[PDB]
Amino acid sequence: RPFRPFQSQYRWPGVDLLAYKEESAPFRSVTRQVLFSGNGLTGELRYFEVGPGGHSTLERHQHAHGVMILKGRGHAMVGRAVSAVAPYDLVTIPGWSWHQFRAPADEALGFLCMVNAERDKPQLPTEADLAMLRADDAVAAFLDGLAG
Amino acid sequence: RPFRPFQSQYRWPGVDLLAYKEESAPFRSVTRQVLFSGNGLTGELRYFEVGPGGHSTLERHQHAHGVMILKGRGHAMVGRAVSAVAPYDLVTIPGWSWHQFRAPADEALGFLCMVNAERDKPQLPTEADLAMLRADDAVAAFLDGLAG
Ligand SMILES: [Mn+2]
Ligand SMILES: [Mn+2]
């Protein structure tokens, strides 16, 4: 503990915070807040916050995502596109693309994520999936934590 | 022209800007950008920017809005609730509520607005509507430009 880094957190009091329980977990240092759901809105707007050195789950599913970076910076992969991201970049994630957000070692990443209210469950990669993904050099670099 | 105020503008190049043509118009100094639509997303995410001293159209309709303030500050009315707003406040607008956003004289107001892709056309108030609205003191104060 010679170094204890600062980290602000974005909150809207009255909206519940879900901190995800880590164990063998495919994610790391993630919280979610649901900003808009219900009211006959067919969409949901969520806010995800990924703590320093964390990541969202590498996954895919039928439903699309529209992401707008809201806080900090980090990296995203969609399909085999890897990019650095910062507020308020738009990340468009078409149905079935593999995707993941990664926070740098020194900073949290926050982003808005719009999805359909009615939607399928995420699927995680098999060993085969990971190996096809890793055949790209930038993708392997991203998954190794080395995109910066 | 002794004073020419600064005003930054939020843009995502590749997304079209719609500047609304003013005449007898119920709005003033408004632009829109559609950040997410299509991809089997049943929602749209738009970005509205209201220039200093401007306002969105005072209207109502069946479809709900979820608004997140993104830039500057200003005032909002929903139903008879009037509040000051600033980034990244959430404004929830239930179906059929009268609503309007107002930019201060000295600053632009920017906000995200999530709606359903399939939705009804806005309705503007009749003289009767305005008079029922104006029966509240804070609402009349807001519509007179005096909420600050
Ligand atoms: Mn996903
Ligand atoms: Mn409206």
Curated annotation (Swiss-Prot), chains A, B:
Instruction: Return any one Pfam family short name.
Output: Cupin_2
- Its job: Catalyzes the formation of S-(methylsulfanyl)glutathione and 1-deoxy-D-xylulose 5-phosphate (DXP) from 1-methylthioxylulose 5-phosphate (MTXu-5P). The S-(methylsulfanyl)glutathione is reductively cleaved to relase methanethiol in a second reaction. Involved in the MTA-isoprenoid shunt of the methionine salvage pathway.
Q: Which GO terms describe its molecular function?
A: lyase activity; metal ion binding; transferase activity
Q: Which gene encodes it?
A: cupin
Q: InterPro entries this protein is in?
A: Cupin_2 (IPR013096), RmlC-like_jellyroll (IPR014710), RmlC_Cupin_sf (IPR011051)
Return the protein name: 1-methylthio-D-xylulose 5-phosphate methylsulfurylase
- State the phenotype upon gene disruption: Mutant does not release methanethiol and does not show an increase in 1-deoxy-D-xylulose 5-phosphate formation after 5'-methylthioadenosine (MTA) feeding. Mutant accumulates a mixture of 1-methylthioxylulose 5-phosphate (MTXu-5P) and 1-methylthioribulose 5-phosphate (MTRu-5P). Inactivation of the gene increases ethylene production from MTA-grown cells.
Q: Which UniProt keywords apply?
A: Amino-acid biosynthesis, Lyase, Manganese, Metal-binding, Methionine biosynthesis, Transferase
Source superkingdom:
Bacteria
Query: Pathway involvement?
Result: Amino-acid biosynthesis; L-methionine biosynthesis via salvage pathway; Metabolic intermediate biosynthesis; 1-deoxy-D-xylulose 5-phosphate biosynthesis
Is-annotated flag, keyword Lyase?
A: yes
Q: What class of enzyme is it?
A: transferase
Q: What is the effect of changing C113A?
A: Loss of activity
What reactions does this protein catalyze? S-methyl-1-thio-D-xylulose 5-phosphate + glutathione = S-(methylsulfanyl)glutathione + 1-deoxy-D-xylulose 5-phosphate; S-(methylsulfanyl)glutathione + AH2 = methanethiol + glutathione + A
Q: Which GO terms describe its biological process?
A: 1-deoxy-D-xylulose 5-phosphate biosynthetic process; L-methionine salvage from methylthioadenosine
Active site annotation, chain numbering = C113
Keyword Membrane attributed: no
Q: Which SUPFAM superfamilies match?
A: RmlC-like cupins
Q: What is its EC number?
A: 2.8.4.6
Chain coiled-coil ranges: none
Tell me where in this chain the Cupin type-2 domain is found.
47-114
Q: Any idea which positions bind Mn(2+)?
A: E59, H61, H65, H99
